[PDB]
């Protein structure tokens with residue numbers, strides 16, 4: 001079997017299906033609407049510039065949501081929003097979104113096409129550690145090799161009253177049950193590792209950092225996955241399993257087992273015939 005990651009065209013089509021077949025971004029929009037204001041409400045105090053470091057910012061959708069809340073809290077204050085993103089393709093879409101969006105006149109953007117570890121090394125030999133007011137790592141720690149080192153390093157870059165936000169799937173999510181039970185059966189690329197809030201809270205406790213973790217229910221419409229030959233269903237099958245052409249390349253036995261479990265309460269909830277996979281997210285806020 002081939003991991004969905006070794007086929008950009010596939011991964012992109014699969015992912016796109018995901019965002020359009022779940023409450024991922026809405027769930028986050030809810031957090032940004034009801035929680036973020038209180039979280040970043042004092043990060044700009046006493047400053048004439050608010051520095052925001054986006055790690056794994058991707059295409060910029062969530063980043064702008066965040067920018068909107070900081071501006072609302074600090075009218076007229078200049079914002080330096082730097083992005084660390086290894087994908088040239090993502091960076092291009094990000095810049096495109098910025099141009100097509102209004103009310104961003106007070107924000108300065110800067111994109112660094114590198115990974116978070118490459119950014120770290122590039123900074124360490126600068127023998128001048130810069131400070132940031134808000135650092136966020138949204139749904140990207142899966143792609144980081146050394147997580148504890150990453151957490152300690154970026155936490156060391158937090159300035160006065162600064163905060164760091166990390167988002168990953170919750171240990172109570174369906175993904176957690178999925179990876180525990182079928183993880184070994186799925187393809188394995190050294191380009192990613194399974195991570196849940198459980199892993200991060202253990203690491204944070206051991207690092208001795210101060211933090212708070214909040215979970216918000218989120219679902220993934222897996223209904224269509226049941227209909228044979230269905231377009232949306234199969235696309236979502238590849239995603240969920242992180243494999244190219246699952247409903248056609250995966251052993252018939254594995255397909256049956258998994259197909260049944262996805263129906264179990266541990267993984268999903270059957271509401272109005274609609275099958276909703278548990279995509280609960282965890283939002284972790286670390287203090288300077």
Ligand SMILES: Nc1ncnc2c1ncn2[C@@H]1O[C@H](CSCC[C@H](N)C(=O)O)[C@@H](O)[C@H]1O
Pocket residue numbers: 055056057058059061062084085086087090114115116117138139140143144145
């Ligand atoms: N080692 C690494 N360091 C930083 N970003 C990385 C990375 N490996 C992958 N990424 C980036 O991590 C992102 C994961 S998808 C992230 C979603 C984005 N933050 C938003 O919520 O929509 C992609 O844009 C990807 O290219």
Ligand SMILES: CN(C)CCOC(c1ccccc1)c1ccccc1
Pocket residue numbers: 004011015139142169175192193194195239240242
């Ligand atoms: C992050 N959300 C979208 C949950 C699904 O996570 C997935 C995932 C991410 C991208 C594409 C398919 C599946 C994952 C697989 C392996 C290692 C780490 C994560």
